[PDB]
């Protein structure tokens, strides 16, 4: 048992090594005539099935102390990480409006007629310059507190 | 209020109006001297900006009942839709391997290095066989669940 | 301001990403169509940028300074256990890449009539990798928990 | 023992046989039947991993005199090294600018939508000019320092 | 007046805008009817020809110290120089043979005509790597000669 | 063996053509069909080569210093103004290139229906090239005439 900032990075790992496991497997499912395969196909095969069951755990464990470690006033952890998210998927929003209104906007190519923005890019980049602020506040915010929880 | 199962239709649909929404937005973005929006882009954006608040409490909401209502013996629901997603993650697993072991590639000559099964594929289709019978089970049990289960 | 090393690293990346951004903005902008004016102002945004500069080069300063200053253990500076972990990293791309270059080069391979061959018991190098990858993430773990209980100088 | 200009130089040296090393012994992993190693794997396998603990020793000792030897009134050579960087970072960036600013792009219809300099290119040339100069001195005043700096 | 090290950096640098100053130039040299020049030209050139005889002094000057400081006995600057660079044209031969004799291309049939290494590359991998060692003891110690020696 | 420094600047050039040859040999002799021998002794042609090398080395070496220390006019080394000559051949191709700039650009230039425009007369500039083209043949001309009369180092 760990910190649950501790448990995020292990996670990240496994399902790499899984996905790096999971390659070689296929790439060793058919073998040269002949002879042998480069590693065990059936002991790959369980190293990956442990990993899953291992990598399962650590989810479950993350989930339940997320949606029960305290984030703030009525906030949970879990409601914070999806606060989060939708920060940024906000902040997305803003930065590919306005630079639609000034850069891949604002080409001409060849016309005798002007292209118009139909709305203040300077009023959007400030609204994405917002929630960008927001999101790094909320994720420091929250790695802080991922590293000093202990795992559920 | 209503039941989470009714909740997770709704969040699908915002997000696929925002997605929609999201679109109009850029297109009406721009335009050429003159022409007029088609339909006006500071109206667009906040009709926007107001699903984002919604689908972010449904969100939160569908999360917060997740995580407290039980599944079965010490598993919450939120305990068991990842099992449900590991038991997906692991039936494509068997079942890409075991094609990938019927896979052929035919070569012009006996003299030629051929490869071969490195595995039994009658054992891995039973494996993935078996994971897919597992998921339905779940995935179903998970949708009556759903359905009779009032949003937090 | 002072803070946590931690939260400093986290500073320098956004800036270093506004920087960027703000940077393709100013080229863009850069020229206008005949009629009108930059959708953002340009000697605005130009100072917006030279601001950043010298903000980020402090905190790049002070990061630098604290890191080779803090010690992580008996006799390294964090300075120079975040060298090892780049040399750790270099490592396990090392072996890994030896690995399936001694298995996957072998059945997307052939289609002649001959045996391809490795000179090497991939097995054995699988493990010297497994064993690089195992060695970064405890270090870069424990830097994480050090950047985040250290005040930035 | 020696100067640490002596260092920067094995250091850069190192890396390039690393990388040639690095290269031979991938091309050396595999073969046909009845080949031989055009040199031995096993062998350039541990010549690498020698110049590895070398390296990094360069590196660590690189890094802390540079991080003690004083450059200037309250400035190590650390500090200088990375104001350099810096100063490059700014001249690519003025420079960039203005022969964006220079560069020409001509239409057919004198009645086309024409873009025009946005900012005096003059300008621009200048401040780039100047920062490149910077770059220069401090460049130069760094290799000195370096030649007649013990290696810690 | 300065060290002959100061003076190389000098040349580079001003080489280079030459280079880019001969860039703006052409670029700047036409244009249509109603334009303007981004930078003046006809100051351009002279900034230009200013550069030129400005060059042209530090490599006559850089030349003659060369020819004139003794590197060690009976060996100019000028010579070691000369033997550096033949150093690096050795080392760059014994480094294409090298890996030209572990080169491999493998063919379809057993019975098609095999070419095999000539030479031992394990010898020729010596030969380069000398080259490689004496080519940087002489750059290291010409460096260092630079940074203690006065322009004439 | 002894001789004018025209003489050894001939010999450089054909030793460096003899070497490029070589090498170019060595590489394709450096494999051979499974059954027979090189068309030529590698191990051969290698030192053939290495002999060249430490050849050419000593015509630079002494090319080098004669340069460097006969007089080509009042106050000027011959290596002085070797470079002189390199310099007056960058200045021409300076002066060429920007007016057929002005003027080449111009031809091939148009399928639109606005004027190009030249920002500087051509005229003046071919000027500017003619001359430092005149003064490139003099200055030549005159280091080829030393060149053969001049014993060296």
Redesign the interface.
């Known amino acids: 048992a760990m910190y649950l ?2 448990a995020l ?1 292990q996670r990240v ?1 496994a399902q790499r ?1 899984y996905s790096e496991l ?14 042998q ?3 065990n ?2 002991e790959i ?1 369980t190293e ?1 099935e442990e990993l ?1 069951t291992r ?2 755990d650590l ?2 464990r993350i ?2 102390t997320n ?2 470690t305290e984030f703030s006033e009525g906030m ?1 952890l ?2 914070a990480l ?2 989060r998210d ?1 920060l940024l ?2 902040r997305t ?1 803003y930065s ?2 306005a ?5 891949r ?2 080409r ?1 190519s ?10 203040d ?2 009023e959007i ?1 400030k609204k994405a310059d917002l929630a ?1 602020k927001e999101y ?1 506040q909320l ?2 915010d929250i ?2 507190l991922n ?1 000093q929880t202990e795992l559920q």
Do not use: C, F
Not at 28 to 35: F, I, N, S, T
Not at 110 to 119: D, G, L, N, P
């Open positions: 900032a501790e990075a790992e090594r999971n390659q070689l497997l296929l790439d060793v499912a058919k073998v040269q005539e002949g002879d395969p480069a590693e196909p059936h095969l990956l899953t990598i399962n989810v479950r989930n339940r949606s029960v949970t879990a409601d999806s606060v939708a998927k906000k929003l590919d409006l630079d639609q209104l000034t850069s906007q604002d001409y060849r016309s005798e007629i002007k292209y118009v923005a139909t709305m890019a300077r980049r960008a790094r994720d420091v790695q802080r590293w």
